[PDB]
Amino acid sequence: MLSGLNHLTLAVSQLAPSVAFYQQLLGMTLHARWDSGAYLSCGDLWLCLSLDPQRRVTPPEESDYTHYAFSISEADFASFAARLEAAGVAVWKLNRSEGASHYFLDPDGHKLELHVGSLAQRLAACREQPYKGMVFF
Amino acid sequence: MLSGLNHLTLAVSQLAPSVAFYQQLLGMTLHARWDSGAYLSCGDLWLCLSLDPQRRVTPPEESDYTHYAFSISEADFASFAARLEAAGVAVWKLNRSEGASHYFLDPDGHKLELHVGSLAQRLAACREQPYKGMVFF
Numbered sequence: 001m002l003s004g005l006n007h008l009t010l011a012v013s014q015l016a017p018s019v020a021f022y023q024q025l026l027g028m029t030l031h032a033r034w035d036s037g038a039y040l041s042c043g044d045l046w047l048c049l050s051l052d053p054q055r056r057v058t059p060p061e062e063s064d065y066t067h068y069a070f071s072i073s074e075a076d077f078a079s080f081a082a083r084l085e086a087a088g089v090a091v092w093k094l095n096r097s098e099g100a101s102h103y104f105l106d107p108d109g110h111k112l113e114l115h116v117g118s119l120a121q122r123l124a125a126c127r128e129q130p131y132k133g134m135v136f137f
Numbered sequence: 138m139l140s141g142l143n144h145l146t147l148a149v150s151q152l153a154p155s156v157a158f159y160q161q162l163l164g165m166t167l168h169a170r171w172d173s174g175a176y177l178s179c180g181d182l183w184l185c186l187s188l189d190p191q192r193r194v195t196p197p198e199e200s201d202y203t204h205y206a207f208s209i210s211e212a213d214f215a216s217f218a219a220r221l222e223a224a225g226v227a228v229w230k231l232n233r234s235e236g237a238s239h240y241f242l243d244p245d246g247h248k249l250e251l252h253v254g255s256l257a258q259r260l261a262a263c264r265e266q267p268y269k270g271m272v273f274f
């Protein structure tokens with residue numbers, strides 16, 4: 001039986017800027033670094049950055065919607081978004097759905113998100129206003 | 138301040154086979170479907186499957202090392218891996234370079250993993266068998 005997400009691994013083209021982005025800009029804790037990767041944590045999340053020469057710096061129009069959302073409190077959301085904006089971090093989408101969301105890109109074009117709200121919150125909103133074809137289980 | 142992973146969203150090319158893979162084959166809990174997506178959970182993980190016409194079925198040699206690992210106990214690991222193998226689930230990696238792991242592909246080629254152990258356990262193992270150049274903070 002699967003019990004949760006064990007780790008997220010992102011392939012990166014250049015280890016130093018990726019470590020700077022996740023550790024210094026985003027505030028994640030750096031636990032270890034080696035010649036070809038790093039381990040960070042963000043709350044319960046175990047993040048691995050893996051140096052990979054196959055990683056392309058990928059414009060957002062050229063990647064699909066796969067993306068990784070980090071939790072933040074509503075109270076902290078706006079100042080963290082403003083931090084990313086000051087740093088010149090690119091946005092790939094505007095929010096049009098429930099709960100605050102900020103859609104931003106990492107140095108290699110990985111699609112990230114800041115989101116406020118849980119699955120329970122989303123399901124409650126969907127029960128009240130179901131998407132087209134929505135069925136609950 | 139970021140606090141963990143709020144959700145993982147995977148772009149999928151065909152919604153129904155992907156729902157079946159995550160729910161029936163991997164045993165995740167299905168909460169809702171709609172014409173363009175589904176919401177599942179795996180322990181505390183919120184997984185969204187998002188139907189995306191841009192998603193390509195991608196062989197593992199054409200994608201980078203970005204991957205998603207799910208936690209499983211030592212007691213359940215081998216039989217779950219063997220069941221995926223017997224069901225014909227494609228793989229993408231064989232060498233255990235990060236401990237007890239099984240590397241397998243979803244229907245669109247998303248790179249998945251079963252892994253036994255926490256970040257703390259991995260760091261302890263790495264102290265004895267470190268990756269080249271490893272430093273611990």
Ligand SMILES: C[C@H](N)c1ccc(OCC2CC2)c(F)c1
Nearest residue numbers: 133134135156157160167170171
């Ligand atoms: C489109 C088709 N008529 C259909 C089949 C099964 C469904 O629900 C069960 C499956 C697991 C989500 C559904 F909601 C719609």
Ligand SMILES: [Mn+2]
Nearest residue numbers: 067069113146
């Ligand atoms: Mn999202």
Ligand SMILES: [Mn+2]
Nearest residue numbers: 009206235250
């Ligand atoms: Mn892994």
